[PDB]
Design a protein around this ligand. Sequence first.
Ligand SMILES: Nc1ncnc2c1ncn2[C@@H]1O[C@H](COP(=O)(O)OP(=O)(O)OP(O)(O)=S)[C@@H](O)[C@H]1O
Ligand SMILES: Nc1ncnc2c1ncn2[C@@H]1O[C@H](COP(=O)(O)OP(=O)(O)OP(O)(O)=S)[C@@H](O)[C@H]1O
Ligand SMILES: NCCc1ccc(S(=O)(=O)F)cc1
Ligand SMILES: NCCc1ccc(S(=O)(=O)F)cc1
Ligand SMILES: [Mg+2]
Ligand SMILES: [Mg+2]
Lengths: 432, 432
Amino acid sequence: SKIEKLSILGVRSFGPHHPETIAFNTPLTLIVGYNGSGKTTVIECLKYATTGELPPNSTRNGAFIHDPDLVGEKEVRAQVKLSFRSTIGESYVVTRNIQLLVQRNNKRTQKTLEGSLLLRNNGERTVISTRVAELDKLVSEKLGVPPAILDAVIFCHQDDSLWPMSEPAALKKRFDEIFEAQKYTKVIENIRLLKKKKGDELKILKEREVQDKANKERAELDLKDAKAKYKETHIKVETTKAAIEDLGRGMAAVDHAIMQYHSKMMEQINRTIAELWQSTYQGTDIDTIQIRSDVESTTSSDSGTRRNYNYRVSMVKGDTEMDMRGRCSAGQKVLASIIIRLALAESFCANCGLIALDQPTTNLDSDNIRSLAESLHGIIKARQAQGNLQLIVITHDEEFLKYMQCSDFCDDFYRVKRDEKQNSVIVRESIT
Amino acid sequence: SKIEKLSILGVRSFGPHHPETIAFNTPLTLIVGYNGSGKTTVIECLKYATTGELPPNSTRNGAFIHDPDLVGEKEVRAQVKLSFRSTIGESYVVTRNIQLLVQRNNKRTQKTLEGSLLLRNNGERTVISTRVAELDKLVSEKLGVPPAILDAVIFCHQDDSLWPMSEPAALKKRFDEIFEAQKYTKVIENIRLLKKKKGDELKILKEREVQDKANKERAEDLKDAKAKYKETHIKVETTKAAIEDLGRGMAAVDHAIMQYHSKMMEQINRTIAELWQSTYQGTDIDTIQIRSDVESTTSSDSGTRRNYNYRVSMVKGDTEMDMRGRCSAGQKVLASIIIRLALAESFCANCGLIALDQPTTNLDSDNIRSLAESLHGIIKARQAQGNLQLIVITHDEEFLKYMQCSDFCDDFYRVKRDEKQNSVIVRESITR
DNA sequence: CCCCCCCCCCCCCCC
DNA sequence: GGGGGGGGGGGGGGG
Ligand SMILES: Nc1ncnc2c1ncn2[C@@H]1O[C@H](COP(=O)(O)OP(=O)(O)OP(O)(O)=S)[C@@H](O)[C@H]1O
Ligand SMILES: Nc1ncnc2c1ncn2[C@@H]1O[C@H](COP(=O)(O)OP(=O)(O)OP(O)(O)=S)[C@@H](O)[C@H]1O
Ligand SMILES: NCCc1ccc(S(=O)(=O)F)cc1
Ligand SMILES: NCCc1ccc(S(=O)(=O)F)cc1
Ligand SMILES: [Mg+2]
Ligand SMILES: [Mg+2]
């Protein structure tokens, strides 16, 4: 999977007339710029292009669309275009359009216009879909990334980048999505319903079997026919019994595979998190952090067995383990959230090396700024040859840039600036 | 007027055995240290000492109290001591104590022990109060600053420092708290009750007067009749006068309140406007302002209470838009600090007390430099008046350099973790 | 009449 | 809005 080029028109501080573009490097796309230049907007456009999700608190009132009053028109059309290649060689472009009207009554109304996923063959166009509902499905499907991963891990909004350190209910929600826990309980539950239904049939069938057996002893129509219906019903009974077991064994197999998958996944995730923490965190006070999962089970013959995962991020010091929630510093929260997202990206999409880190050194001190950068350099070096990585870093931290030593990977970087009209523009610069 | 010495024992990463102290300088207290040193804890304990409020997300599970498991004991008692001077010369110390038990049921529970406000006559201690409910009221009076200002503005938790940029209701609640509208609106309602009651008496009185007028006219004992007519008429006029006095008093009260609200918002926006133009490096935002929208019609909760809506606007050229859902991370951080500086300056203009915890979060190099230079200008201007007590926590080295603390400081404080991973506060010297 | 202590209420907080 | 814990308040009792 790979993302090639992004096009932005009329989104936030990007003007409505002339599209601005950025092309993504491998293994690293570096984006710098002043406060309010428009860097975070770039990642907003990647998330919108891939999922149709708009930034939180910007979904209505057209905060996402370049404000009509600034340009002097009563209507502004926004457009985002993303070109990418699927896991197989294939080449796609997704376009999305959104409109913002200022009516004569000053009322603003936002409307989502038609978009399109189109396939390019040898450089020539074919329409795959023009329905926004399918685009979400199709793009992630082509990219090789679940939507829950695009949303929470890869294109995580800067305002939301600390979700791993949030309250338990919220944390659970995001892991439940990432693990699709609602989907598999619905699987288990449907099988259970079917099993109960086949169970009701079996009671009726055994009755009938007892009845047809007796008619055969009395006949013993006629005894030759009397044996026929007895046999027909006997087979339905035995056949139903077998069906009941198969549904039951299958139900158990599904539950077991699901429970082991979850364990394996969590074991991998905690390993990476432990490695990332021990390498990068300079403090002595926390040796490692871990995601601990507490399963709540409720078992009844009517509701069968339903598992509920509760999740916690704990920090480990010596013998002691404590829940980090409500107990970690601003800087610790920032580092833990980045590492956990890296760990999830590595476990859940082991092969698409895609993640956006928007201003990773927030609240980090000088030592941690250095080590984080060197760890990022270390991740890149290890995976550069494999061709796996498309990593996007946004920063204006000069200390961070210096220690990353990105020139080893980059021939260029992108700078987002405001022009004289105060429009966001994206200029490509030489690594020099 | 001033805060002198703080003592911390068994709170978070501070060990339960030996208390750490910090002494506050004028005009500036500088506090540095690595991620997780315990710098934010210091500000929490200041809040806790003055208002009794604990850090958000820490009122349960005793997250604020140094964890019993770390020591090898099952119970920890925390203590925080703050010595300060009232608006008058008087010298006080408030002490608060907290306990966190690992119960017979295994999970932790926290309990609030005895507290004390103690007055110092040099060489003699006197308990002014040992009422944990009363400490809040007494302390805030002595400091000369309202409880909601200590909470939102002076000692605002780092996790909460962006509240000005929060959702409308959340912003409104805090401005509401800051604007104590309940006490006086209830005064108005009680006057209104009386005014209405005199109104009914007036209706009955006017009737009786018409009756007495006719009897006087019939007599034209005539002297008796004129007496009764006058008597009744003077009662009518007297009641009218009483109605007018109550009515005018009601209006004077209500008017005084609207004037106060207007006056403050005006000063607040003046200060915010100067700071923005003075501090913000960037062409895209000329100024920011706080707009107050009154709900056309006051809702009735045991009185008629006006409902204000508040919004933070950014101004560029002719155009104005709401910052909510539209500003960058750095812009949120800068706007929130400036709004707090302005809130301190207008609402407790007399005592220059504020804590800035990691003020350069997500700020670019230029905005880091200019913010530092603006603080320098604020300090230089008011140093002579002796009012100012500014507390800055930072590990931003470029920021420290532009701050030029040597002009104002003879020493600064460093927070460290000792070999046992306990937070320690070390005092260090500066050249000038 | 002051207050002190306990248990319980209710209140703020967090969900 | 509700639920739970804990602080505080409330009421009864004693100093
Ligand atoms: N609807 C809108 N119309 C016009 N301008 C907008 C709109 N919404 C947001 N903006 C502005 O566009 C900019 C968006 O920039 P961001 O991508 O958040 O900046 P940034 O580069 O991430 O800066 P940071 O986060 O401080 S490092 C902000 O400066 C907003 O003030
Ligand atoms: N109940 C607790 N028991 C023991 N340690 C705790 C407890 N609560 C918090 N801590 C630790 O104490 C530290 C809190 O110190 P802070 O003041 O938040 O850090 P800081 O100096 O502000 O660092 P920043 O915000 O990253 S610059 C963290 O490292 C926590 O791991
Ligand atoms: N997207 C990169 C995911 C990743 C890949 C590798 C590592 S490492 O711990 O083994 F160095 C960490 C994170
Ligand atoms: N606590 C007061 C903060 C403050 C805020 C603003 C100023 S001004 O001189 O630049 F208008 C001065 C002081
Ligand atoms: Mg940003
Ligand atoms: Mg902190």
